[PDB]
């Protein structure tokens, strides 16, 4: 099995601890843990290509894409590698993360690992939103919080 | 080329960043930027295993070390794969950092991206300091700042 983690953070309220699991190559990744701050309702959540939070979310580049495909929903053919299901934040701000995902991978082609997950103002509209924008980021808006995926034991 | 990229933080005090650059497979690593809020002189500087920030620096484990070695410097060939040179802080408290290392890489066993690098409250001896955690971790002392070690554009 391989193990990741990624500490979300950013420079309003938004925060969390996210771990991955992968237990054979190729295989599931569970993709799990808690995110508070953020509005009710649902948030993008993107594995983006570059681990660099040297100006913040920012140059963490675009969604992790190695065949230069179209933005997709997490079900669909064509998708990202880094398009992930959105998360679901309570009244409370608190969105409890629940991701089983075998595009991502924790080894090979499609290893995330230093690689930076980010978590967005607005929900991913799956690239059906009918726009050229939907087609490449899913028009989530902005980046709140991110940080970089690592190694966990 | 490989690239990768690294963000220091810990609580306030320190603060860097620091590039990684491979040119090509199983060849040397160029390792430079600057790291602020130093005291003047040798602070240890070392990637740890794991990319786990989710308690601080505490959680980035030990030294990376797949075969299980002795702790050394970098010339050493008994050493951990995470064993950099000393980093210098200047008279401000500024260390620019400008190493090569042959034994880190950013691919293969001794892959360091998703690893975290850390930078320490005093000098790493060595593994020369006639004792056992000289042998196990250099005797750096605290753990000033880290981050996790991501992939760069
Ligand atoms: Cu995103
Ligand atoms: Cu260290
Ligand atoms: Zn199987
Ligand atoms: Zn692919
Ligand atoms: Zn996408
Ligand atoms: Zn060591």
């Known amino acids: 099995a391989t193990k990741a983690v990624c500490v979300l953070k950013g420079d309003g309220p938004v925060q969390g601890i996210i771990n991955f699991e992968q237990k054979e190559s190729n295989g599931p990744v569970k993709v ?20 660099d939070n040297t100006a913040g979310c920012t140059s963490a580049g675009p969604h992790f894409n190695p065949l230069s495909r179209k933005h997709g929903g997490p079900k ?56 050229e924008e939907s087609t490449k980021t899913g028009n989530a808006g902005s980046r709140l919080a991110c940080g970089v995926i690592g190694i966990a034991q």
């Open 32 to 51: 799990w843990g808690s995110i508070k701050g953020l509005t009710e309702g649902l948030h993008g959540f993107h594995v983006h290509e570059f681990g």
């Open 76 to 131: 669909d053919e064509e998708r990202h590698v880094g398009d992930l299901r959105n998360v679901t934040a309570d009244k409370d701000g608190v969105a409890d993360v629940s991701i089983e995902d075998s595009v991502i991978s924790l080894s090979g082609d499609h290893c995330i690992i230093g690689r930076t997950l980010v978590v967005h103002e607005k929900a991913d509209d799956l690239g059906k939103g009918g726009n």
